[PDB]
PDB file of C-alpha atoms in Angstrom:
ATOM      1  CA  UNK Y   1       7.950  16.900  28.566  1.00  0.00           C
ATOM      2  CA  UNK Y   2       4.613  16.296  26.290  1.00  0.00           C
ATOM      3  CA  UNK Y   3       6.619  16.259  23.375  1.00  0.00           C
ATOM      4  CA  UNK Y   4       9.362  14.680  25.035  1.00  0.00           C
ATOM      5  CA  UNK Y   5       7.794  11.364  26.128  1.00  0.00           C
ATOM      6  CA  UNK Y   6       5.655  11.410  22.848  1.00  0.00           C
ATOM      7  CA  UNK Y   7       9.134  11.185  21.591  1.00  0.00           C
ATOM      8  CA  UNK Y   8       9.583   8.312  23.456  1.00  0.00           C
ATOM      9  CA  UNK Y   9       6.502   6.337  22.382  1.00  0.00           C
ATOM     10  CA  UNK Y  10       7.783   7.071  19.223  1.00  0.00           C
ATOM     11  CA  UNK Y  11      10.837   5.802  19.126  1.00  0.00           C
ATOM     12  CA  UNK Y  12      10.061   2.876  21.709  1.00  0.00           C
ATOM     13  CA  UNK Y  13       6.682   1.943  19.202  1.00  0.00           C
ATOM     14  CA  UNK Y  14       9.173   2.307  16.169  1.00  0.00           C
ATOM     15  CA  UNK Y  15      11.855   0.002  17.862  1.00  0.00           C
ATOM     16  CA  UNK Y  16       9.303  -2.763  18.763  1.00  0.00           C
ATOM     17  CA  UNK Y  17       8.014  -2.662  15.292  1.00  0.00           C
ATOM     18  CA  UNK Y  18      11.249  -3.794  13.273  1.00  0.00           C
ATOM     19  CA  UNK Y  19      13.220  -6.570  13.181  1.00  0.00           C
ATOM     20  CA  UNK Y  20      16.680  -6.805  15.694  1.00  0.00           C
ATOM     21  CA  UNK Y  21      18.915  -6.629  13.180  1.00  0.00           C
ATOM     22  CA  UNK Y  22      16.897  -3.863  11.361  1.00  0.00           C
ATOM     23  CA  UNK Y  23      16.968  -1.666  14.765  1.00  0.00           C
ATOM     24  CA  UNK Y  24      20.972  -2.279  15.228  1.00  0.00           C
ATOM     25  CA  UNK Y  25      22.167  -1.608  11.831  1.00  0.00           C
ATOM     26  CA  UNK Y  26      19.357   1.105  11.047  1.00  0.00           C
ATOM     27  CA  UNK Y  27      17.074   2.490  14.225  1.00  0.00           C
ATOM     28  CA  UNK Y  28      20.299   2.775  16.284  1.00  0.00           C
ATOM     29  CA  UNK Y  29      21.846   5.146  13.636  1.00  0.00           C
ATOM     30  CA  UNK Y  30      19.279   7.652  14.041  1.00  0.00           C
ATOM     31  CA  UNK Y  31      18.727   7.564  17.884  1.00  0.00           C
ATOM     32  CA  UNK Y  32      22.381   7.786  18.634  1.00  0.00           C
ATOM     33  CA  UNK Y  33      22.694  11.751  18.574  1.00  0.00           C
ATOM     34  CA  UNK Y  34      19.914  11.670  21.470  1.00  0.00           C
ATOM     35  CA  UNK Y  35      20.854   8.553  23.464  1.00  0.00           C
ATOM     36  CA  UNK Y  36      23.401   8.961  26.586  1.00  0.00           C
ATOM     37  CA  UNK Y  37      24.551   4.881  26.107  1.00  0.00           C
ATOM     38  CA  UNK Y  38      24.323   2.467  23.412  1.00  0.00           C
ATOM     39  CA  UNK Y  39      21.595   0.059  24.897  1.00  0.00           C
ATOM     40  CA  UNK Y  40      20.468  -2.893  22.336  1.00  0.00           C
ATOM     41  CA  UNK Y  41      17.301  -3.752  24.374  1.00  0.00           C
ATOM     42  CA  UNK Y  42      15.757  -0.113  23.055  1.00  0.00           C
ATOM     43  CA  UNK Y  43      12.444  -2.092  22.728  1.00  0.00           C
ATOM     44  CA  UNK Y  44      11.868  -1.881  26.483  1.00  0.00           C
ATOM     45  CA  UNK Y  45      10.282   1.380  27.320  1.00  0.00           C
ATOM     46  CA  UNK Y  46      11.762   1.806  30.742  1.00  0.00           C
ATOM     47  CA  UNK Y  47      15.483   1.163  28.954  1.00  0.00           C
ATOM     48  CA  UNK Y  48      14.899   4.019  26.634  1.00  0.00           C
ATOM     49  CA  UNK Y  49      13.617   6.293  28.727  1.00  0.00           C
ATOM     50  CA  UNK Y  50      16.999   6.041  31.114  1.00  0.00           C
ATOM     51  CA  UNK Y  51      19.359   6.305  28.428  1.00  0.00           C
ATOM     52  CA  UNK Y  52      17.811   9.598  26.881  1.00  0.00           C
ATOM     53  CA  UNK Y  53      20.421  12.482  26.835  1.00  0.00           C
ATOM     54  CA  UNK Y  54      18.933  15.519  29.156  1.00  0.00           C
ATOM     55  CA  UNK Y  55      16.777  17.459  26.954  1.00  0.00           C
ATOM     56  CA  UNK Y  56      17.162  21.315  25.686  1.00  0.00           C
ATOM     57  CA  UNK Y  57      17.108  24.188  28.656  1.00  0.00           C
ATOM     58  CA  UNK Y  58      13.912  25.597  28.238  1.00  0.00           C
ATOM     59  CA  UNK Y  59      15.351  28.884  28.603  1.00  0.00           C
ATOM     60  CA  UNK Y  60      17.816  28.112  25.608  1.00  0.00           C
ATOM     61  CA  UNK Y  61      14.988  26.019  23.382  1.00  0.00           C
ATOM     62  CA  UNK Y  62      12.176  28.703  24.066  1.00  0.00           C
ATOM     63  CA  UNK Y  63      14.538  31.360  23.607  1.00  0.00           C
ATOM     64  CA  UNK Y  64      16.120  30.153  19.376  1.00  0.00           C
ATOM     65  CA  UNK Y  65      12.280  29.429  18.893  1.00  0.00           C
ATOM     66  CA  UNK Y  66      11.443  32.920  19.692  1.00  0.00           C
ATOM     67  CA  UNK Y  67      14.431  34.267  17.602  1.00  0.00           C
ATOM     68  CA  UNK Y  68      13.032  36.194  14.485  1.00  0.00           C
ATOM     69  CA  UNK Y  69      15.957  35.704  13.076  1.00  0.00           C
ATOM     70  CA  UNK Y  70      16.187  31.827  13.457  1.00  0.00           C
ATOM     71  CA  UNK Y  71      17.814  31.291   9.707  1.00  0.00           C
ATOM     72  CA  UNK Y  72      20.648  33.373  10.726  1.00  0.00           C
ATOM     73  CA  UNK Y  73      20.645  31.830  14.286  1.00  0.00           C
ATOM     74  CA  UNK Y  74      20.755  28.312  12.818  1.00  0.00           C
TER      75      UNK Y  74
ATOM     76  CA  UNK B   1       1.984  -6.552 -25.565  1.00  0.00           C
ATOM     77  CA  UNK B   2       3.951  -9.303 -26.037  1.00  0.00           C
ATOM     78  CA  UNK B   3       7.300  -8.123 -25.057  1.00  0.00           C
ATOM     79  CA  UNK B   4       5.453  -6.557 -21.948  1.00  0.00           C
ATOM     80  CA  UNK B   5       4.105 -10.012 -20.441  1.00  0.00           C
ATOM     81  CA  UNK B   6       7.824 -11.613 -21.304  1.00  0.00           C
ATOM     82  CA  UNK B   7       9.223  -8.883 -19.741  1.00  0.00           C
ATOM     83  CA  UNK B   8      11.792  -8.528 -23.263  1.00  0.00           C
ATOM     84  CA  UNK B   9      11.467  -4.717 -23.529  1.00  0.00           C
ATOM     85  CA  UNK B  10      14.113  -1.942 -22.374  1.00  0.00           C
ATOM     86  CA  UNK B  11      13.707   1.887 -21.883  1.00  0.00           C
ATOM     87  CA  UNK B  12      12.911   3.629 -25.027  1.00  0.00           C
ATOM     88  CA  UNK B  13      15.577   6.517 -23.945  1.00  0.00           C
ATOM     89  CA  UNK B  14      18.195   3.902 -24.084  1.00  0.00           C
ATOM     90  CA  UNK B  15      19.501   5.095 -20.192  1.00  0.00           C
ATOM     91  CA  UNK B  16      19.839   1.123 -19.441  1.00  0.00           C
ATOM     92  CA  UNK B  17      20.149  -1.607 -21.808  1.00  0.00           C
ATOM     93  CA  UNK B  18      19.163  -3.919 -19.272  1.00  0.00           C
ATOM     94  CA  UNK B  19      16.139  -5.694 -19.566  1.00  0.00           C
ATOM     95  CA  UNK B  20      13.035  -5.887 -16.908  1.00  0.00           C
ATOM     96  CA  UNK B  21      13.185  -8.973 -16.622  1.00  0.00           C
ATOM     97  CA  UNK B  22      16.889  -8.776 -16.366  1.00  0.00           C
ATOM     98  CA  UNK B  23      16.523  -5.926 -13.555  1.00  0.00           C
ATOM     99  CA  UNK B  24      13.945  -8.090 -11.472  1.00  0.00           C
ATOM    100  CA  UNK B  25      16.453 -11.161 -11.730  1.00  0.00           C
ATOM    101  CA  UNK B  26      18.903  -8.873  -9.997  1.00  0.00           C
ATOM    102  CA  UNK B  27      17.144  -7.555  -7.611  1.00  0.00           C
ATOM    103  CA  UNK B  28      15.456 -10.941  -6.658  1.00  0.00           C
ATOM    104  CA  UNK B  29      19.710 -11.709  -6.148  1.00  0.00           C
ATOM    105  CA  UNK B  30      20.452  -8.994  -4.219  1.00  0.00           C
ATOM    106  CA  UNK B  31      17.713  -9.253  -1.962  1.00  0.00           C
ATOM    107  CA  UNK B  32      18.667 -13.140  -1.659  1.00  0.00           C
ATOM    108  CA  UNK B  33      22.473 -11.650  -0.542  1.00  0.00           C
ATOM    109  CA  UNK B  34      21.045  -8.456   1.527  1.00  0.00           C
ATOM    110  CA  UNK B  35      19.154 -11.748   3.744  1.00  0.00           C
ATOM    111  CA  UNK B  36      21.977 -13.285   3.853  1.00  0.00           C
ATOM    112  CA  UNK B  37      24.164 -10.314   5.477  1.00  0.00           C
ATOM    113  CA  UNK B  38      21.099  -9.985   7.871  1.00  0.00           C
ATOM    114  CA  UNK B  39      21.759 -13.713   8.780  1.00  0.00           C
ATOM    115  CA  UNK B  40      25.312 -13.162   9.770  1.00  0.00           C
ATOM    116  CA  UNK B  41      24.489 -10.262  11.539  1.00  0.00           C
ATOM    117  CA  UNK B  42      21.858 -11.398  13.519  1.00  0.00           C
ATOM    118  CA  UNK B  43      24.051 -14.478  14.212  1.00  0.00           C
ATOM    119  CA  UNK B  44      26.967 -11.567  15.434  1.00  0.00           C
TER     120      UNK B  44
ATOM    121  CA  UNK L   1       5.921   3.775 -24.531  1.00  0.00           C
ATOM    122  CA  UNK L   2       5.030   5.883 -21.206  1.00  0.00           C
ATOM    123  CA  UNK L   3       4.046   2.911 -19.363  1.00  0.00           C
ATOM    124  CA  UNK L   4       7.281   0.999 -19.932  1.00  0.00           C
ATOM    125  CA  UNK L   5       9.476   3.626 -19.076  1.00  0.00           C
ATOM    126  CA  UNK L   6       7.516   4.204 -15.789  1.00  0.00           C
ATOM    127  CA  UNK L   7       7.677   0.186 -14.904  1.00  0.00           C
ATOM    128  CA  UNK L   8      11.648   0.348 -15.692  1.00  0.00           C
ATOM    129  CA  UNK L   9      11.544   3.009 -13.379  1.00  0.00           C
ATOM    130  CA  UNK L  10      10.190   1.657 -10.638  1.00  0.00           C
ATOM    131  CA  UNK L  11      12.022  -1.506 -10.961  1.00  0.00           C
ATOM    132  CA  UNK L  12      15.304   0.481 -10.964  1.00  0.00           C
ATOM    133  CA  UNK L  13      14.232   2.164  -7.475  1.00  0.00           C
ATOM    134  CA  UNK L  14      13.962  -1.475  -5.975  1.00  0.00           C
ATOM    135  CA  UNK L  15      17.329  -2.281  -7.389  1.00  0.00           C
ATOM    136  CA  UNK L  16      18.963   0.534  -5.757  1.00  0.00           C
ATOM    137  CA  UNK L  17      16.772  -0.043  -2.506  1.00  0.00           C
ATOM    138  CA  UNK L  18      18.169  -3.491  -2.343  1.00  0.00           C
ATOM    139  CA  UNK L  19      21.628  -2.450  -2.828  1.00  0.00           C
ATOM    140  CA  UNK L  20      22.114   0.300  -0.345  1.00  0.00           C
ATOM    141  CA  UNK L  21      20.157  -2.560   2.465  1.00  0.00           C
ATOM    142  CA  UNK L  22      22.893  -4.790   1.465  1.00  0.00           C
ATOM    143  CA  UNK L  23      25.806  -2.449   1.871  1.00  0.00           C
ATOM    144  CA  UNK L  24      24.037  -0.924   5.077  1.00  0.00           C
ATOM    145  CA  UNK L  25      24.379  -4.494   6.290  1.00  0.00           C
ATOM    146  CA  UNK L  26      27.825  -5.392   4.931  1.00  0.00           C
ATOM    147  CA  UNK L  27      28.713  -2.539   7.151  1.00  0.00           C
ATOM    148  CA  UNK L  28      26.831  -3.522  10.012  1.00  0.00           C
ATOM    149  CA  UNK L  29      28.804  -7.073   9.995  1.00  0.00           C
ATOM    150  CA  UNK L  30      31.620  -5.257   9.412  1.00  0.00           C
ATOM    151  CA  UNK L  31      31.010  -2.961  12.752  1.00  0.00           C
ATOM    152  CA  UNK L  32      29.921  -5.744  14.879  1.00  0.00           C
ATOM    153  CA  UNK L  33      33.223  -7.983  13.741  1.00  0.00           C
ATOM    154  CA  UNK L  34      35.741  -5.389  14.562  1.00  0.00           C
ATOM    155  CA  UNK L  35      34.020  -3.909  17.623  1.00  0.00           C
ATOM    156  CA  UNK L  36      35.972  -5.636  20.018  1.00  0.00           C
ATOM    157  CA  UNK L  37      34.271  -8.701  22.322  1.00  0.00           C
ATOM    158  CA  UNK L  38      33.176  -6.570  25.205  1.00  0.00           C
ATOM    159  CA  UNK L  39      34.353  -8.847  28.109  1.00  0.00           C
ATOM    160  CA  UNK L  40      31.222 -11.153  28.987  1.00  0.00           C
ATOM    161  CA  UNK L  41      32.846 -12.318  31.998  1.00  0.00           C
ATOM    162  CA  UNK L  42      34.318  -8.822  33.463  1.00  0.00           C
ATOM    163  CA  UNK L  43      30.575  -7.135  33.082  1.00  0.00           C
ATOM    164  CA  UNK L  44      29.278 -10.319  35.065  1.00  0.00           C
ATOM    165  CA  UNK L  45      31.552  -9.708  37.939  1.00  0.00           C
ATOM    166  CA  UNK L  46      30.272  -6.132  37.926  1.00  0.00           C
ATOM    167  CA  UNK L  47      27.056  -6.914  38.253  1.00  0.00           C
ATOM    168  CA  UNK L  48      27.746  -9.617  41.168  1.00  0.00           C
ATOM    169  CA  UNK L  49      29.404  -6.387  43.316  1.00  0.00           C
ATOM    170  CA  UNK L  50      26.586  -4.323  42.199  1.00  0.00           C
ATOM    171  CA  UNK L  51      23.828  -6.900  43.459  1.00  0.00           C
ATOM    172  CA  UNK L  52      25.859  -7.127  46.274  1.00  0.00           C
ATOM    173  CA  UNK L  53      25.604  -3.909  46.675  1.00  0.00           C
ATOM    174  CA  UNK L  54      21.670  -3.253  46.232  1.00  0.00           C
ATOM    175  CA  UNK L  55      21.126  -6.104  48.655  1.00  0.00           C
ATOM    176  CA  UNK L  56      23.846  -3.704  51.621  1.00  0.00           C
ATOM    177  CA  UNK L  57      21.256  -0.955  50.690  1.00  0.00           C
ATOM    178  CA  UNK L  58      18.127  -2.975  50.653  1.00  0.00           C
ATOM    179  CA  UNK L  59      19.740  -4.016  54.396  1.00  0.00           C
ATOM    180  CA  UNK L  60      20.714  -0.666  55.391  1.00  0.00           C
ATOM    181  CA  UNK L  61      17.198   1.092  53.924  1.00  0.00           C
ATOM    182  CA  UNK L  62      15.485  -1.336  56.051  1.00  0.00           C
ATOM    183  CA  UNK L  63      17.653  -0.064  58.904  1.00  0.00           C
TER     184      UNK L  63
END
């Protein structure tokens, strides 16, 4: 969740910084594998927050992490 | 020097026959048309 | 010699910077023209049942 909402302030800092048409035709592209719905007000941090696809089972994420063998995992 | 502050000199490797000056010329026009895109878009 | 081929260089990295934000929005217009008008009126009579809605709850959580 740490890393998670840092996330957020990431993305939400990044999407206040640039211009509209910047964030549609170039910070959407890269949030859209993550986001649940296409939102264009991403600069509120509230919005962003809601539309944020349910993160990795911590069961799953802790357990490819622990793999030794990650490079044949991945 | 002199072709330097002109901006009349090309790459000594012959890659691109276009000049500097030439290069900054286009790019001064493509950033003029990449503004305008931006324009219509943000109007859309 | 080394210095001139390092300022064509550079100047040919802006060029191509410039033309792949042009064609990024080309394609952008291009997206938001042929995405189809999402109904501005239809989402606004959502949103009227949906207030409508909040305020029954608003009502009934007072209850």
């Amino acid at each position: 969740l740490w890393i998670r909402y840092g996330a957020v302030g990431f993305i939400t800092v990044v999407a206040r910084q640039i211009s509209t048409a910047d964030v549609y035709c170039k910070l959407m592209p890269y949030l859209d594998p993550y986001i649940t719905q296409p939102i264009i007000q991403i600069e509120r941090k509230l919005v962003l927050l809601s539309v944020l696809k349910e993160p990795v089972s911590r069961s799953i994420f802790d357990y490819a992490l622990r793999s030794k063998d990650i490079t044949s995992l991945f | 020097a002199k072709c330097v502050q002109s901006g009349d000199f090309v790459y000594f490797d012959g890659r691109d026959r276009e000049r500097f000056i030439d290069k900054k010329e286009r790019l001064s026009r493509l950033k003029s048309k990449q503004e305008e895109f931006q324009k219509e878009v943000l109007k859309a | 010699e080394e210095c001139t081929d390092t300022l064509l260089d550079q100047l040919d990295t802006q060029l191509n910077v410039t033309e792949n934000e042009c064609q990024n929005y080309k394609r952008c217009l291009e997206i938001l023209e042929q995405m189809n008008e999402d109904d501005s009126e239809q989402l606004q009579m959502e949103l009227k049942e949906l207030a409508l809605e909040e305020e029954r709850l608003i009502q009934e959580l007072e209850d």
